[PDB]
């Protein structure tokens, strides 16, 4: 019912939703609607936040124009348009990053933006890209031209050569970055193995296995101390893994959302909480014990709030 897109912000504390009539913004935990704005530009198919601030990046129904919206002024402040379709947008205090199906372009956050860099990628219809918003780390990471490789660039020291991480041997399905910008997670289209690398050296920090049968991977996210990750896959299934204990290869906890719809995942306010936002409009909250067993469960429809 109108839901075209959903996605977490940089601290996972909020998520934004693209609607056929506009966009919505919600607090992740506890769930609370923060804003709902009508914007009849064909419906919004991608919303990017910048933490909790007044600037949001919106992609219109034609998918060929990026619009920066100031929610305090209640108007679009910047428009960038493209001949090809925009697949994703990422934001930071001093840079606007736009992802296309074959390349990525970096612009200034000025009234009239100026294109600073362009970077080539493999065919990327999923819009895979991660950008660190921290002041001391302007890292950008994207899938390279080599199928299964991830390329990393520092947007501050752009003259430094890139890091080419040979993550997988097949097409990449998902990429995720930790809250400090030091560690990057990767997954292939087979969806059997998941790999964590150091962004500043390129080395394989941990490898994890989620199953034997092939399954498409929708979302991956770390917790604040980067000690745990959560991963989402078929029929709304989510797996929770330990990242810093190499004695563990499998997930210590697993759950499925009540409707079985696919979902994105992140960790909540409590250190033992995981939050799932589902494509049917469902909100789900999962609390676990150290053995991975559920101790509390909460479910709601966030579009009806």
């Amino acid at each position: 019912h109108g839901l075209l897109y959903a996605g977490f912000n940089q601290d996972h504390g909020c998520f934004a939703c693209g609607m056929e009539n506009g966009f919505r913004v919600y607090n992740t935990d506890p769930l609370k609607e923060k804003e709902k704005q009508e914007f009849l530009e064909g419906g919004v198919g991608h919303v990017e936040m910048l933490f909790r601030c007044n600037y949001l990046a919106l992609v219109g129904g034609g998918k060929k124009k990026v619009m920066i919206w100031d929610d305090l002024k209640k108007k679009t402040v910047i428009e960038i348009e493209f001949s090809t379709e925009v697949k994703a947008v990422k934001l930071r205090r001093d840079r606007i990053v736009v992802v296309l199906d074959s390349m990525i372009k970096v612009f200034t956050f000025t009234h009239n933006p100026h294109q600073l860099h362009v970077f080539e990628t493999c065919y990327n219809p999923k819009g895979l890209c991660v950008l660190c918003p921290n002041s001391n780390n302007s890292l950008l990471a994207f899938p390279g031209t080599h199928t299964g490789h991830v390329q990393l660039v520092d947007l501050a020291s752009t003259e430094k050569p890139p890091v080419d991480i040979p993550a997988h041997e097949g097409v990449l399905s998902c990429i995720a970055l930790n809250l400090q910008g030091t560690r990057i997670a990767t997954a292939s289209e087979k969806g059997t193995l998941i790999r964590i690398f150091d962004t500043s050296s390129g080395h394989l920090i941990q490898e994890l296995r989620r199953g034997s049968q092939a399954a498409n991977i929708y979302c991956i996210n770390f917790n604040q101390d980067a000690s745990l990750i959560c991963v989402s896959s078929d029929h709304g299934t989510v797996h929770i893994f330990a990242a810093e204990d190499p004695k563990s290869k499998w997930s210590f906890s697993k759950f499925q959302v009540p409707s079985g719809s696919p979902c994105i995942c992140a960790f909540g306010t409590e250190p033992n909480a995981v939050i799932a936002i589902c494509a049917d409009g469902s909100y789900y909250k999962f609390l676990f014990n150290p053995k991975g067993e559920c101790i509390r469960d909460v479910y709601a429809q966030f579009l009806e709030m």
Binding site: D94, S135, S138, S157
Partner: protein, 50 residues
């Protein structure tokens, strides 16, 4: 210390343009104002030398 003053002026005036990688633009407005004050100071005190 004339040439030290001059070289500091030159270095920091180049910094007003070349935008170091970890520096938000606010600081560079302050720095450009400071280097402008240094320009006035130096050119007033040492006109021919400067």
């Amino acid at each position: 210390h004339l040439l030290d003053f001059f070289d500091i002026f030159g270095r920091l005036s180049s910094w007003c343009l070349k935008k170091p990688g970890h520096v938000a633009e606010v600081y560079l407005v302050h720095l450009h104002a400071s280097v402008y004050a240094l320009f006035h100071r130096l050119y007033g005190m040492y006109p021919c030398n400067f």
